[model samples]
Target: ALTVVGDWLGDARENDVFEHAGARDVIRREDFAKTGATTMREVLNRIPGVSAPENNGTGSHDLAMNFGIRGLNPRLASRSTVLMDGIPVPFAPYGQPQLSLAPVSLGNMDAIDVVRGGGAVRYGPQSVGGVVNFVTRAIPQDFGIEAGVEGQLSPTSSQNNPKETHNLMVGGTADNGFGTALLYSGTRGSDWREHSATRIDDLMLKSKYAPDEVHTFNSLLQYYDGEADMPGGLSRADYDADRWQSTRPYDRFWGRRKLASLGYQFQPDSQHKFNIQGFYTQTLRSGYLEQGKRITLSPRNYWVRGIEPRYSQIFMIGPSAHEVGVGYRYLNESTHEMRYYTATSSGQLPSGSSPYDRDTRSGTEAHAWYLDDKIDIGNWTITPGMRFEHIESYQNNAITGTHEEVSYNAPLPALNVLYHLTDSWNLYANTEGSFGTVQYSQIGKAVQSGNVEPEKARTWELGTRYDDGALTAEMGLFLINFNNQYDSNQTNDTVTARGKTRHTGLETQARYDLGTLTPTLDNVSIYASYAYVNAEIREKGDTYGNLVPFSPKHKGTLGVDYKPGNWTFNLNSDFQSSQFADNANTVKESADGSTGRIPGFMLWGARVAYDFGPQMADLNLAFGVKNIFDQDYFIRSYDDNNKGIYAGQPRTLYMQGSLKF
Candidate 1:
């Protein structure tokens, strides 16, 4: 489990003295075998304080899934740092996002980890939201290729639109610690809506070599290309009348992302380890919007170059022990972007139009250094860390013909503590400082023009955890105070209109095994999670007492699963309360999707799976139904004051089979 450990940073080990509540959840291979989850939304359905709002019901078919942590308002730009084997996955490394590129396929990964609170101090550029790392499995030692596909034909009685996905992995290792593997996954499908098709392609090559016991080298080359149709947002009336209509056809996104990373690891002794890594990424993303025979194309391309070095060592102090990790990172990003319009008739090509076009060029560079020390004393484990960041941003706008440059520097620090109170429970506390943006502040918006202030936050948390055999539970409370938030109304890089906001929340989750109490339900279990957030504008303004929009005050999930022998079944329900549609938190209703009241509702899912056992080549079959009750709902609302609402998926089902040999 690669829990939020930044690139080159080590993972949290069992019994680590510094472990605390909210350190994170690790979903391992075994969990995947039963869930057969093909999308991140389905994968994280049970975690507390986390929400993935789906636009198209099935996470896979959505143009963009709004992901939020602990009731934070979400934008197309992801608040959390997402990684594939610790390599940054966003097109804009330290800035905005190309939200259309689905993260690496979970079917191609071995595990996923989430780290929140102070454990975030180690990751750079952006960690205020948290960190999610997808770890890919390695080549097997014994045999070879493993492949599988998951699909389902819709509605048993009608003309069906099918969803299909396939995943394949091949390669193996030698006795010399030399290994190699190739992974490939693709999706070809149409959704419940007509002309709402999606296509995804992902490929990767990984290799490792260990010439000697102390030295090792690893490399990864990955390429991803994908696109999904966007039928456009529906107005309240449109949603109520025809939720499945593709009101705006010919709207879509195309993305091509590639990454290459090489790493070196050295271990002088069992307790001493060091790692150095370097990587490069080139990302190109574009959107095509069609309106009455006219098309507007927005394309963005960026290049990233980065280097990181870190080391960790364990030492004995008296009868206890300590672990120290120090790391440094240097990264640079350069972006070239353009948005142009073309006129056409009867689907004619307008290559010769050469009409008016916009030119925008931006560049960002950063340097960071961090250190952490985990100390064990008696029954207590404590980790204290600090980090420093220096950023420079430059931009040029052709539409406004404005050019400007800006810089920012921030120092972040954090401390975490865990105290073992009993054989089954532990008390923990965490405090951390996080930073917002300095570069790529307002992506295509010319108003900012490189003039933006630094946003800052300092959070404090306390909680407790209980884990012993069949029972696992955690409860935590957090208070986050943020200052210098961006202004509500734009004045191009200046304003004190919105100076501060506060987010306070309590989160809890529990899982209990029923098999421990009864004999008939040998492998039955139940789980529940809840999160409550009171986010408000506390800076004394016109909206001083207003709650943050789209961030609900209550979110909860309840689930039950049964497993006996080779069969397992699961049923779960997730719910969210009503949420404001705009900054004012008004209850007003309007025809515009941008400004109004957005209601919330509950959603359910069910899964049934059968495993033939590893003795049968690791074969397992699974079937799942999402939105089982077929509730009509919207996951996103623009609330800009006009027709605004993004409808989620209707009831749908899928089946999957996977094998390894």
Candidate 2:
């Protein structure tokens, strides 16, 4: 079972497509080795409906995860519910969902599962976009050790700050039913930009114990720290002359996370089971940038503690079998934030106390309960689930001596149906609802001036899939009705607007092995995926019917793979359609290059690998090239000081080696 024990969506085996009644995509460990990805963005872009754009705004480094699903805004990946081994990744899962500092590293992950539909019951507030679960390596049944290192350099730029990444894993199981493992992954160096340097360190200790066949215990302790140069966006003139140039030498970001978790599972028999888990996390993230002539310093800290328990049972009713699950979660979170300002000179700030500006504190207490029943009869499977959330949030401003508090509750319901037309084909349909309350940034004004409604969305999806080992195909149609969409301007730390919107889309993907048709071609395979979306503002204002900012209408990928003897080769390409950078759909670029249409881009990647077989500690080597054609692309950000055009990755080359014992 490569998948985690208590996974919510993916199956427990490797190389198996998700069999759940929803739209899902899974990438296994082997895919990582085959693709030779320098960052998670390369791998995530292959998903059918996901948009993994380059770093935007202050996230000018590869450590950032700018993901959006079904035509949602991709800033800081605020719309998705991201998790590592089933644990929330954000510092405060309930009150703050943005990934200002993504904690997990792609090198340590064993698998990635993205569930795009019908996950409202088990996940929460931000599930409207989707749930991304990164499964890390688990203790092996036999003693084992693995280590790997990768180095990348850009050939198109002269300021070469070659990047390097390293990963290590060591673990084994004892006869006494106890297992322990240690994992470490880190990256250091810059990419293409002048001031865009980055360093990351992630380490984890994991343990599992099976006291008996029915009782099991597991735990995890992790520490992560990351820092990167912001390299503020450039002006039109600057971009035209040298796209890779950096202008804001003073912009920078730093983040750290400490997390711990414990879990217990009891399965006396196959028909009945119970699982309980608890976690505690602390995070510190800060940003320093020159906003005009003044240097701005913003730092924030968060503390979160939570617990979840679930019970399930299976019973027979006539000729049908029913599986029912009930679950509950409780969470507590607190945050401390401060902002300082100083005169900017030579990219340095003067004494700190004199620049003191403002301070704030916030907290959230939340409780959620959910239940679902899966009924299987003949060739049909149906599930109905419901979830209820009660949340209380408060904010206090020390400077103004102002305090605000708000509380609300919501009900979420879901239904899914699957029909097996044959052993190799299946059809599924699902409908679900999700809710999100005011965040720390939206609370001050929402409580003082007027009311801020909680965001709500209902989604419906219908899809079909076919797989016969050699050929696989999947296609789906989806619609989302979103109300009170919360809009924020990260540049000024303000909630700009709230309005209703509609999103409709189609997703399709297929893969085939050439050898399936001819013996000589069995060593070759091809895969392709595409998504088309119509994200429009439904509000009856001047912006009615306008396409949502940053929501590209089309995205697709094409790839080929060839395996001959002990050598493997891969080539892949992905594309994104033109999109607007502002809600107004401005066509002409502004003087600062912040407002305008963003042109589409297509990038190609290639990889080659060789294996030394089991005779040499299973040693392997690989070389890869990203943006193989040296294509030119740019990303635009609307954030205040960070606003401007940013150059995308250029042609880069990397080589990696690994060995296991």
Candidate 3:
């Protein structure tokens, strides 16, 4: 969003003052604090097309995982639109964006903004694979307080068992402007082949206040609770005869999320600004599985509230330079839809309660009006944008009192182009339009089978980027034309499958700066990334052209980092190729089959860090290792109860510590 956070002052890993035209990726918490990253899937697996593929181990918490981007719908990221410091962290941002309770904690975050292509149409209904901002940290006015703690341990690339992870933070402020912060993250044990295990706890609170000078106020609160141990899958001969069999361990799943937010900002000088924000969230979760095999339990709940108002300006209409932004957002929601399965099965009952087999209640109201403008002529830069979304939903079957409703409205547009060609380099292009809707358990099957329509996408891009002063590079080529699309099937709960999709991609990233490629590698650095997605599926029958099933047509990353002063070191690698988990792209699968096909893997990691402070900074340390050669492989596939392989995670270990005055 190139700037226009309505006056936010918190460094979420931003240093490039203002430079935005296309392709973006920023990750900073010391870039993973030397790999002490225990979640966020090892810092988004070094970016590129972004993927989390699915894991119940390697210690990330949720037994349900899969955060995919770009190749679109990879089993729910539901088009991915996550934000924290920039607000909107799903509790039904629209109607159930199960983001599993927001992420952004490296002990209170510092940055992460990944606009994986698709010009973020002002963060609309899942910006269609673009927009993920989690910048926090920053809230110090100096008065006291600053602390940290982190840790990690692993072995559970399926049955390797033993796991541990953590993060903690404390904050401070006060120069008369007031501020506060606190955070907690977690994960703990069990891959113990069925006795199962998982526990995740998260807590967050942030505050800010200013008594004068045109007002400023901010507040955020969160408390998330998690549960794991839902080892349901495996049948390719029990996953080739034992893919870390937890078989169903009596089945289980869990959830809990709560959030609160408030904001106020108004500045009358230096080009005008105004902002108002309010938020409320609530969620409840439950689980139980085994569809055809019978045995069931389902639970769900959600509540959301909102109000967002914004204004921005930087004048000079006739002088070849301009900046403007305006906004409106109002959201409302309340959902509880689920119920099926009667129970039975006791590999050892870790979870099972709830006797529902189909219950419902839903309501949603959404509205959006937006505008953005950026213009400059000298070195050429032009940005144009607009959004007008109006969504509505209603469902109430309170055991047959009957009531259903559905709606969708849209007016989305975007354009961006940047050209600078030489003082370093720049050439960009973008086009956008995004939308998605209809979820409330599919709004009673789209109003009892009356068909409701809402899901469209359009994105195009051409990129070129380079930074001469220190070497930074980028390459992009993207295309997306998705219509009516819905394809998602969490093993039969909120079923999805609605035609037409296509995506083409080629993305690249590079960073090289071995102290200017000379001087004996002074403070060395090296980075590489590549992604090639040909998401396919331009349906005409039986999933035409295949591909696109938990997508992965190629992915790569490589890195090497070293810092000689105070010492910090790094080494990394990750790769992927081979995909298919459903949409009829089946590939020799079937052992009890739900759908299968997954193979291709690679991983290696390393880290070392040390820091000795000059003031009350104290000492900080980091040591790490992840999958280094212990790779066994298994990226994604959860064909429900037949238990489609979800293994991966053989080597993992990490450590971290920090303290400050």
lDDT of 1 by residue, 1-661 (tens): 1122223223333443125544466666567644445666656645677766654311224435456666555554266666777777776656554355554776677766666676566775556667666778666765488888878543521325576778899988788889899988777776665545778788888888887888989898888888877655666687677665655554667778788999999886778788898999888877666645576666778888888898888787786677788888888888887866677454642232545476788887888888987777888878888988887777888789978676778788988888888888898898887777644645333234443556677878888888886998888888888776553422222333434678888888888998898887678999888888777777665666777766778888888889888888988887887777656666776564545666778888889988897677979888888778987767445522112566656677878888888
Q: For residues 498-608, could you state the per-residue lDDT of candidate 3 as single tens digits?
A: 666788888888888878868899889888888888887786665677777778878878888988988878897888887877777778766654466777787888888
Q: Candidates ranked by TM-score, best first?
A: 2, 1, 3
Best candidate, lDDT: 2
TM-scores, one per candidate: 0.90, 0.96, 0.34
C-alpha lDDT values of all predictions? 0.69, 0.81, 0.69
Regarding TM-score, does 1 or 2 come out ahead?
Answer: 2
- Candidate 2 or 3, higher lDDT? 2
Order of candidate numbers by lDDT, starting with the best: 2, 1, 3
Instruction: Summing lDDT over every window of 10 consecutive residues in candidate 2, give the lowest-scoring window.
Output: 1-10
- In candidate 1, which residue ranges exceed 4 Å CA deviation? 1-21, 33-36, 56-65, 97-103, 152-160, 290-294, 343-353, 398-400, 439-452, 487-499, 614-616, 639-643
Worst 10 residues of 1 by lDDT: 1-10
In candidate 2, residue 550 scores what lDDT? Answer: 84
